[PDB]
């Protein structure tokens, strides 16, 4: 039945209210010592006790002691090499069930149990996420921790099940402890104090939502900023216009997604499903059924640095001197001003930009642009390419000002998605694809 | 409907799917088809799960050759991934179908049911346990008072899963949660909606019972909550068969008493009136004594009076059986151990596990036909004290040390 | 966040008031004496204690003692006649604001303050409803209690504000304690234990709703039974036939109200708004958008009584020699069991029914038939007359088997309601309006 | 916009309306009209309310004749009906409009405020109070904890409505809600969504303070919940101007302490550190007495010190104002009364009415500029006990017996 919606609501409410209810720096060595103790503990009370302790000791430790520990999760808490070999020989001797099971057992690094146990401490999950954040930041100077992050991903993928994710409008009636977080995760608009915030949430032509999961109480995991309007924008400058006149909800037909952000560093790479946006769309449709179309005014981070690599190679598959000439006009502080040099680049940029999307592919079989991977993964369609839609000194170096417009269509959202994942079809508008 | 072959095929498809919407659709269809399948087609699919769906050997082999060549971290990590039965990914995916968790839990009931006739299915069961252990986290287990204001669909489930003192109909039911001197609680998990994973039936009283009949019988009169001083756990039921062997934590009862205490601060003594679903099965196996420091010559003597249609009403041939049986029960608890070195009896494992103390042995505390089949009407009282729960649990788990009252550690031969 | 926010909020507060909401025999004289203490009391703690005491006493009192007390409310607890006259003379002397203020104070009987205070006892409102049920049951044999009932209505009206009325679907996920009460309030269907209720609610083509108000926690005031179908019926027998084959709710296109009941005798005559069915329709629609037509299959209690009066009237407005002659058929064992007698009657009856519905008014000016006053007031349209829709011995004595369908169109509910209340215009279909003389 | 006359016209159309749907439509349209209209039109409508909307004389007289011609119960009940001012039906109708109760509460504020300048409005007030008493039934009042996880639009209101120790910004607010040594409760009623009618600010401690400075101070060390034995009610506010004079019960505090203890059973002593707004105008009117036993020559002199601007910052002239004031405060309390046998202090009538007993007169407990303004920096304590609350309440209401402490009586 559908009663499942109420049951989970009631349940997640007991969980959150419960959460809102509930020390001296340690060295890298002690932390390791403590881990071993926790891994051999049998009692459940002493277990959470050692766990909470370890987590407090780590949060308190000096940046150096922290790294000593993370490194140890690589060297001292991987699988037992002896056992694993024994187990390998057995399988090699007879590919039996007994042997194929002990192999699965012996190949599991001890870290997994350690993380599974640390997670029993009150606040454990939140601390664990902050820990994966530290290892993610340590991969560079210590590639070894890439395997330590692998195990966090495994476990996290299991905890943050997409079935328990939930969408909530983040308006002025939202709990203060949560909004206080929004002040921090706010990407676009500026917000220093609660006044800036209320003001930010005030306008009736502005909206924003958040996805919450019971594993992290009162934590908006994904933040979705929307703008209500009648026209489908091609420039960001206007939507963020502080002195412009805002309209009314019934006075809109096109909801435009100007910002979508993952708020927790430690959750990078953890999928929360691919029909997120679809949900944010229905919420808007249920509230304001007038809204006929749903488009996004997303950026294109990676295009500029793609135009670099693609130009630096004088043996481009489709980029001659005729182009490379006027092309490098971008190599000037201010070029977007000269209305002349502007209309010159438009055709050439939009032409290479179209390639960057439908043509360019990253490592694995998938679009190079990260924002494309997302919105496209979410069944949207690469509808329009707004040249110079963001002339901010930020976007100018990010994508040379180039901004695009993905369009979500309730009808064929799932359709595009299957296309993209099963085959490779990059749902794009005809007007953009004819720039090969 | 669908045949084992067709299910096996659709499984394969689901496993190689890459689109979410299409994946969930395939998962919802396979589950739907499995349910419609036949006892033969079903055993076919559960079996194809124990053979075709184990770890992929081709990929396991490469991973091993790679590790042998270079035992690098990447190689070790690769070996783990490839050592995973395909079953696990299959199970994880069906779980995305709506009602999958429930469906999945019913499927595990099905393998746990066939395991005896098909010991290979046991390898499939291990993987459900691995996932289930991760899905049913104790952190989301929620205690919820269950009374007459509780939805009917849920109450209906309690009459069906009540496993200690059978609840005949809705009147017996109302009888157990409507009186102000009666209390019921249940633990719920977001993984299974409206499904009380574990529910406890307590009786608010002034004394520590020794027989259920008095608690059950629809005759006696209640008593205001503020009047009682003692809470008595007279029934504990683990509802989902497919959830057998998944620990929900050892401090479950500690929560039910913390609840009862904040509500009725007038209740300061907590005990249980529990069964012993493994005593008749023990004593009988012990009656074919090849050589035991327990039973002797003048032993089986009174142990015959147990084999009657009702030896529990004639003080004659029974009063002679009380001190022999209790002497032996004291042996069944403090000495008899299960294959894992834990206390032989399931219910003593639960309560001792929750920090309770074996406080008293009640000879013939339950006369019902069920009580007779389990331990010859034998029942015991475990005691719970918030101040000792943690210690007893820790002491039991860390050192295998059982917590029993002196008045019982003595009755051991 | 104001239409949905106020609902979030109200739902919440109500949930609190729900869990929060989840005695010796006295003589009429003692109860009356007590009412006097309570009335003069000043402390809140003792007020409640006394009131709680009086209610318990009343409950346990003898039927004679209850009755004496109710009568006491009429003669002893009315307005103080002395000061009332004093105030009348003050105002006749000079109609000042202070004069009409005191007059208003002077006219209010002590019954009101007594009821208001008894309402503070826990379980007070429920007890007062039960008590009002008693005075309602005694107005015949005791016409003086009518002025006691008038005071109850003034307070109940203010307490049971339509704004807090909430609609809830009633099914197997509904709390047992509420379902238990439902097993007693069930109208059409027959229900014994829980197997009946569970059975009666199981079918996917059946759906009943309830209206709840925070004043009477866990209590369904108005119970609405509906049937999911693919056509607007003309006879109940089929709908109620257990040996019928249900249909998936998604397959249905029609929603048919076939039972609407007020569950609290003591609430009789208290309005909960005219847009009740509106809410039930908007609800079904959002759950099953696959339903376009909203129609009822109502009874016409009081048609038989009316027809009798029309016949016994030697000067009947529209009963010629023929009609009178044919009608005599209605006065036989099972005339309905003769296709010929039936088809002969159908034209004359249906035509009389039309004048009944469209012309027969009440002692005020409202449509005489109580079920029509309801559905018409709920903005419905009288859509069709179903000759011989219910041949159950009951329906036969009620309206000679005559049933009807009222048509609810979620686009003219307000229009029709306004017409009936503002202009007195009945919303009937031509098929029936062009059937009147 | 809309003129007072067009409003009075609408009201008349609403009173005779029979249709429900159009009934609430006109009601919404009147509320909105009144709401956004010049002050002058407003006073028009409100004065019309006292004038053109009292009872209908015709009907009232007809009803009078009948009663004089036949004092029957049916004639009586009919008189009562006709004595009701049309205003009531007007209000009752406007209240069906979406958001009417809130609009109506605001309108009462409009009249209440204009009374002093226009006493004929007091009559309008009278029917507002009649209806509000009925509507704001105490049984639907709900106690709710108000911490940092509370909806913003509500916390905002808590800020805006503080009336004991002003809150300046959200951080300052966060301060009274987040710190574990702190707590806050509000009372909500279904008639006004998200509107905290009454809200209390308690400072969990382990003693019984006599000054606010050490409570509201940002620089302070927190204390765990269980690390407290007491509870200190330092601020209590009644939020709705328009709900002035409507009782929400007399056991509001008994509910809060019952909640604090069920959570922190480590608290076994609940006391307040309340102000005394009725001390300013009392002593300021006191020294204008033709005669006053509580004010002699030897007193009215050592009391002259308070006249200076800043005398609270000198250990010197201050210890003479300690015994003379306490004896007048202890008098003002146990003695002084208002137009009724009830205590003159609006805060004492609240706490005593709530079952508390005057336990101490913490001299100069408030240094705030507003504090001196009223109680001259003086503060008092009130002791609540889950044993005497009901007993004290009764004594005060049944017999006017002011439960106080010996330490305070003699003075
Ligand atoms: Mg795993
Ligand atoms: Mg009145």
Numbering used by the authors:
A (entry chain C): 10 to 31, 37 to 450
B (entry chain D): 39 to 451
C (entry chain A): 8 to 29, 37 to 451
D (entry chain B): 39 to 449
From the study:
Unexpectedly, the MCD catalytic domain is structurally homologous to those of the GCN5-related N-acetyltransferase superfamily, especially the curacin A polyketide synthase catalytic module, with a conserved His-Ser/Thr dyad important for catalysis. The catalytic domain of MCD contains a central eight-stranded, mostly antiparallel β sheet (β1–β8) that is surrounded by at least 11 α helices (α1–α11).
We solved the structure of RpMCD by the selenomethionyl single-wavelength anomalous diffraction method and the structures of AvMCD and CmMCD by molecular replacement. RpMCD and AvMCD are also tetramers in solution, based on multiangle static light scattering studies (data not shown). However, the relative orientations of the dimers are substantially different. The central cavity of RpMCD tetramer also contains a helical segment (αA′) from the N terminus of two of the monomers. The 3′ phosphate group on the ribose of CoA is recognized by Arg387 in CurA (equivalent to Asn421 in HsMCD). This residue is equivalent to Arg387 in RpMCD, which may have a similar function. The equivalent residues, His423 and Ser329 in HsMCD and His389 and Ser312 in RpMCD, are strictly conserved among the MCDs.
